[PDB]
Amino acid sequence: MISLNGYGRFGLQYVEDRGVGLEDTIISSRLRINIVGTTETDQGVTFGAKLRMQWDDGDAFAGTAGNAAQFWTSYNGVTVSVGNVDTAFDSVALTWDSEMGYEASSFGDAQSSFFAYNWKYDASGALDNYNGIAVTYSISGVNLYLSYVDPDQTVDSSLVTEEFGIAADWSNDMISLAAAYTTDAGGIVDNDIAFVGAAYKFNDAGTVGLNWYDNGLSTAGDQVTLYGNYAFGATTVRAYVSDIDRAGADTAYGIGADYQFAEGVKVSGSVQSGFANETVADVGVRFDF
Amino acid sequence: MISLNGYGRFGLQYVEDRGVGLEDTIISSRLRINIVGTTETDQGVTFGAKLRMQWDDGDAFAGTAGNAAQFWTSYNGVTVSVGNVDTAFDSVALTWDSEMGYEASSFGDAQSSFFAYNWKYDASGALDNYNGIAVTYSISGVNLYLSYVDPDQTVDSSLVTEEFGIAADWSNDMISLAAAYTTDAGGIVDNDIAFVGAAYKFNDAGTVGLNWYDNGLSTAGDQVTLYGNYAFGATTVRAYVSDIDRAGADTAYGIGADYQFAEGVKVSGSVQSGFANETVADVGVRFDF
Amino acid sequence: MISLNGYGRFGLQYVEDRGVGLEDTIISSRLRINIVGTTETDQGVTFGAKLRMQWDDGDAFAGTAGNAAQFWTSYNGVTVSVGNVDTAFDSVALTWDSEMGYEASSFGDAQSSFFAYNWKYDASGALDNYNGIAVTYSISGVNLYLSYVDPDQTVDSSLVTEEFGIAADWSNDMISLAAAYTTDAGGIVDNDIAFVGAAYKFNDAGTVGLNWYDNGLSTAGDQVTLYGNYAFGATTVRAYVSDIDRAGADTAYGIGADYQFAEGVKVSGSVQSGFANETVADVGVRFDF
Ligand SMILES: CCCCCCCCOCCOCCOCCOCCO
Numbered sequence: 001m002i003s004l005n006g007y008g009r010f011g012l013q014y015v016e017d018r019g020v021g022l023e024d025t026i027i028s029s030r031l032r033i034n035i036v037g038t039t040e041t042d043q044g045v046t047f048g049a050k051l052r053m054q055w056d057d058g059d060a061f062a063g064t065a066g067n068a069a070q071f072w073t074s075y076n077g078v079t080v081s082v083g084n085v086d087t088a089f090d091s092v093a094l095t096w097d098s099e100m101g102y103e104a105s106s107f108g109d110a111q112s113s114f115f116a117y118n119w120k121y122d123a124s125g126a127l128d129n130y131n132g133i134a135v136t137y138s139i140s141g142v143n144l145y146l147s148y149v150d151p152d153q154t155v156d157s158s159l160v161t162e163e164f165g166i167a168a169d170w171s172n173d174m175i176s177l178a179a180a181y182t183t184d185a186g187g188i189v190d191n192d193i194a195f196v197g198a199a200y201k202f203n204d205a206g207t208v209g210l211n212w213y214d215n216g217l218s219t220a221g222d223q224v225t226l227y228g229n230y231a232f233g234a235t236t237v238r239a240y241v242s243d244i245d246r247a248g249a250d251t252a253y254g255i256g257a258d259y260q261f262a263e264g265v266k267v268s269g270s271v272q273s274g275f276a277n278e279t280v281a282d283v284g285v286r287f288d289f
Numbered sequence: 290m291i292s293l294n295g296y297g298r299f300g301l302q303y304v305e306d307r308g309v310g311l312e313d314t315i316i317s318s319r320l321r322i323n324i325v326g327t328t329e330t331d332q333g334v335t336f337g338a339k340l341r342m343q344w345d346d347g348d349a350f351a352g353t354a355g356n357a358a359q360f361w362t363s364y365n366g367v368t369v370s371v372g373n374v375d376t377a378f379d380s381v382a383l384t385w386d387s388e389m390g391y392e393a394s395s396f397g398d399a400q401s402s403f404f405a406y407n408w409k410y411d412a413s414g415a416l417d418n419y420n421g422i423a424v425t426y427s428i429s430g431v432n433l434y435l436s437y438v439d440p441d442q443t444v445d446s447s448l449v450t451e452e453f454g455i456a457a458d459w460s461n462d463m464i465s466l467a468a469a470y471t472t473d474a475g476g477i478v479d480n481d482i483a484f485v486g487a488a489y490k491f492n493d494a495g496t497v498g499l500n501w502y503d504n505g506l507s508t509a510g511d512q513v514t515l516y517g518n519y520a521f522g523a524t525t526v527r528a529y530v531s532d533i534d535r536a537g538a539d540t541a542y543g544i545g546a547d548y549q550f551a552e553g554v555k556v557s558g559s560v561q562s563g564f565a566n567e568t569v570a571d572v573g574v575r576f577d578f
Numbered sequence: 579m580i581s582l583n584g585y586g587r588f589g590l591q592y593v594e595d596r597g598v599g600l601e602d603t604i605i606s607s608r609l610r611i612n613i614v615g616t617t618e619t620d621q622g623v624t625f626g627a628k629l630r631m632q633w634d635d636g637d638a639f640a641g642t643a644g645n646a647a648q649f650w651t652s653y654n655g656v657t658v659s660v661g662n663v664d665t666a667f668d669s670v671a672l673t674w675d676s677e678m679g680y681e682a683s684s685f686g687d688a689q690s691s692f693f694a695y696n697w698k699y700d701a702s703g704a705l706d707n708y709n710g711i712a713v714t715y716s717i718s719g720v721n722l723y724l725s726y727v728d729p730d731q732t733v734d735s736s737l738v739t740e741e742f743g744i745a746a747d748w749s750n751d752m753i754s755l756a757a758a759y760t761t762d763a764g765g766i767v768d769n770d771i772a773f774v775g776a777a778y779k780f781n782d783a784g785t786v787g788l789n790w791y792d793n794g795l796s797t798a799g800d801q802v803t804l805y806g807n808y809a810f811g812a813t814t815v816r817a818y819v820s821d822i823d824r825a826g827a828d829t830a831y832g833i834g835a836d837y838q839f840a841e842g843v844k845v846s847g848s849v850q851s852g853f854a855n856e857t858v859a860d861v862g863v864r865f866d867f
């Protein structure tokens with residue numbers, strides 16, 4: 001069986017004083033198509049393959065291509081994936097929950113470098129022999145994630161730096177906890193990064209969370225992000241404040257809202273301020289198909 | 290929801306004396322696949338996204354890729370589109386109705402340069418930041434079309450020439466009228482082009498039309514195309530004669546036929562003569578899937 | 579109508595002493611997606627178009643694109659195809675039946691060069707004007723195949739070498755016979771290649787075959803491949819031995835097995851030795867979707 005799903009989004013993206021002779025406000029848009037082939041067996045083992053075709057405004061050549069494939073095998077809650085895999089530090093819960101606006105962004109997201117599923121081709125040739133192995137396991141609200149990424153599997157392994165990550169999250173109705181650790185993140189020797197997060201559902205309607213990061217070799221240093229969101233009918237309000245250790249950095253903050261227009265259609269906007277005082281704002285719509 | 294539709298065509302394409310050491314007759318063929326994602330809401334607003342994957346014989350690399358995306362929102366007869374849009378001068382009725390043969394061509398089509406939906410990627414980099422906005426509205430047999438195309442939306446707007454177009458068409462059972470006007474067509478300063486057309490259904494079976502064009506900065510000058518078609522059961526006969534103002538140009542003319550083999554399958558051919566005395570002929574088949 | 583089908587495969591590929599500073603064992607994987615548009619008529623004539631999107635580990639840019647299109651028309655057992663066609667020497671029965679392992683390979687396959695369906699784009703530009711015509715006809719267990727491939731249909735034909743192939747196969751329940759001949763194979767003057775094969779079903783369970791080849795201008799010279807396979811429930815065992823005329827060459831051989839895990843899911847492995855003493859081994863899985 002082959003299925004196709006995806007989403008389109010479009011809207012206004014504003015970057016205060018973007019650059020000499022550049023428009024500060026542009027129309028930023030994305031089309032994402034996922035192609036998923038699955039083979040289900042009577043033994044209870046599923047086999048799957050996936051490809052993505054994603055286009056963003058500004059993409060080179062004004063064209064769209066597929067990325068590199070991802071393969072998986074699932075049995076009894078355990079999934080093993082190979083090729084262009086989802087990594088542990090990118091897949092744990094909570095770590096991206098401060099994101100807001102129609103482009104789902106936040107200065108409160110981790111400021112480190114690490115491997116993650118590659119959405120598109122890479123014209124530099126850097127990903128041509130990149131291959132990962134991932135293993136996930138979900139047991140009674142607890143998820144274990146493990147990933148191993150080799151940037152160039154064809155070359156002798158003592159000559160390449162491979163990335164190893166581990167993560168877990170846990171949740172009941174009110175509290176969630178998550179943690180992740182990745183060594184030699186992004187293929188960079190000694191770039192060991194870590195994440196510890198927690199969130200509290202303080203109402204059926206609202207949540208408050210705190211994420212902490214060790215950003216490894218990044219200049220940001222350790223980081224803390226406090227965020228919250230509250231739902232009023234179809235409207236959700238979101239906010240966050242984030243601080244990094246880099247000397248002289250400002251406190252980053254953001255405020256936004258989402259409006260659930262219909263099933264599959266979400267209108268969102270945000271106003272945010274970064275660590276170097278950048279001022280960014282967005283307003284747009286996402287529709288899932 | 291995601292749907293896929295398209296067409297294939299193949300046949301013989303003849304160009305008298307095409308070039309030194311070149312075959313005059315080649316097998317010309319096209320495969321077009323449209324990928325359309327749509328999100329329908331109970332509020333009566335539809336959201337859609339589309340991508341095209343088109344291959345033509347002779348295409349570089351012997352490969353096929355997707356183009357840049359187009360997004361739209363529709364409500365109550367009004368449609369607003371963004372990104373790789375259909376433009377007013379390209380979408381009005383009547384303007385392409387002299388086309389014939391299996392490749393739908395005619396020297397009687399407008400000889401000007403103007404923006405239009407881009408079917409494929411562009412390796413030059415010219416379309417990387419191209420973005421348009423279009424608005425259509427159909428009211429009781431009358432269609433209004435408006436388009437705005439910015440060739441590079443990232444650069445300050447006083448440094449780029451944007452294209453603005455407007456068009457309308459109107460029809461009852463017997464007569465149709467259409468007009469279009471576009472300023473700075475194709476992003477070229479002062480290339481202001483215009484179109485006025487009319488057609489008369491003089492039988493259930495036949496139609497005769499006249500299209501007039503102001504081709505802006507093109508060397509063709511003003512142009513007039515007289516065309517007609519007549520259906521005899523499953524066979525349609527078509528003809529046209531076109532004249533341009535360019536000094537020394539010949540009168541262009543064409544004669545062709547279509548045969549509706551089955552629903553979705555059309556066999557067509559034509560013999561045509563251009564403004565510089567070029568002699569072209571084609572015979573082939575198109576099938577819709 | 580448009581349909582999508584394909585397969586994914588992944589596994590371990592071992593090449594003894596692959597190269598200085600190279601890993602001998604890598605994870606080799608493939609994703610293949612076929613897009614087929616078909617138009618069926620009440621006259622009994624079917625029209626179809628196909629495109630392929632295939633990704634393999636190691637592919638340049640870590641991206642996937644479509645190949646060049648293939649078109650066909652079918653009526654009463656006869657099929658005529660145009661564009662990126664299947665060729666006679668590649669489509670006859672028996673010629674590939676010694677293949678084994680999850681990558682379906684064998685040193686006992688023909689060692690000649692010849693045109694065949696192109697699975698992907700070609701960045702060299704060599705296939706940009708490549709166009710073939712093929713005609714197949716299946717009559718009571720007998721298949722006739724004819725193919726004509728012009729490497730560059732735009733250039734005068736006396737300047738290009740075109741490939742012409744013919745083939746036939748025939749089978750009853752117990753015996754199969756096949757033969758093929760192709761002149762100027764692969765567009766190389768005087769590279770005339772030929773194949774004669776036969777197979778004997780010596781049980782409901784097992785088959786033994788012999789393929790003979792004239793490899794044209796290849797350095798391999800004439801070649802003979804003896805192969806056999808035997809099925810024990812869901813497990814199939816396969817073997818082959820092949821010899822070429824090239825002076826000094828070793829006898830190539832291979833042993834492997836397939837295990838039919840479920841409908842659409844096959845686990846296969848092999849150990850093989852080539853004409854230059856190369857040692858190769860594989861183990862992996864293929865799943866069809
Ligand atoms: C195989 C799938 C198609 C992907 C191949 C595209 C290869 C294009 O580039 C060739 C090398 O030239 C460099 C391109 O410029 C950078 C492209 O990507 C960046 C923005 O989207």
Ligand SMILES: CCCCCCCCOCCOCCOCCOCCO
Pocket residue numbers: 012013014025255256257269270271279281282283
């Ligand atoms: C200085 C911050 C405001 C940016 C003003 C520049 C105006 C240009 O419009 C850019 C489009 O950006 C959309 C912002 O408006 C939506 C606000 O956010 C909603 C929650 O408070």
Ligand SMILES: CCCCCCCCOCCOCCOCCOCCO
Pocket residue numbers: 010011012027267283284285371422437
């Ligand atoms: C012909 C239009 C005037 C030319 C100015 C172009 C300026 C661009 O944007 C103006 C707003 O219109 C278009 C964008 O679609 C996104 C709107 O916001 C999303 C839903 O809340």
Ligand SMILES: CCCCCCCCOCCOCCOCCOCCO
Pocket residue numbers: 060061063064065347348349354355410411412
């Ligand atoms: C991103 C989707 C894939 C489209 C990228 C293809 C980029 C290829 O070119 C890289 C630059 O080299 C120039 C190519 O030659 C012209 C190609 O198009 C013309 C005929 O179809």
Ligand SMILES: CCCCCCCCOCCOCCOCCOCCO
Pocket residue numbers: 301302303314544545546558559560568570571572
């Ligand atoms: C000089 C005009 C005729 C072209 C003769 C060259 C012959 C080569 O065949 C090219 C294939 O072109 C197809 C034309 O035949 C179909 C005719 O048009 C039908 C309506 O009158």
Ligand SMILES: CCCCCCCCOCCOCCOCCOCCO
Pocket residue numbers: 299300301316556572573574660711726
């Ligand atoms: C082996 C064939 C002889 C090699 C000559 C190649 C010459 C090419 O064209 C000959 C005609 O056949 C093929 C084309 O398919 C399109 C036919 O017209 C369309 C339906 O009316």
Ligand SMILES: CCCCCCCCOCCOCCOCCOCCO
Pocket residue numbers: 349350352353354636637638643644699700701
């Ligand atoms: C038009 C569909 C996209 C296919 C175009 C890709 C063109 C990329 O290359 C541009 C020229 O540079 C050379 C590329 O390196 C070789 C690529 O293929 C070999 C391994 O998969």
Ligand SMILES: CCCCCCCCOCCOCCOCCOCCO
Pocket residue numbers: 590591592603833834835847848849857859860861
């Ligand atoms: C020397 C031949 C054995 C190769 C040993 C190297 C070991 C590395 O593993 C490579 C993965 O290859 C899979 C082979 O094992 C499956 C055997 O074939 C099955 C039928 O006899």
Ligand SMILES: CCCCCCCCOCCOCCOCCOCCO
Pocket residue numbers: 082133148588589590605845861862863
């Ligand atoms: C974290 C794993 C240890 C890193 C070593 C990477 C070595 C790679 O392969 C080890 C085996 O695992 C993965 C491959 O999936 C294919 C297995 O065989 C197919 C079914 O019989």
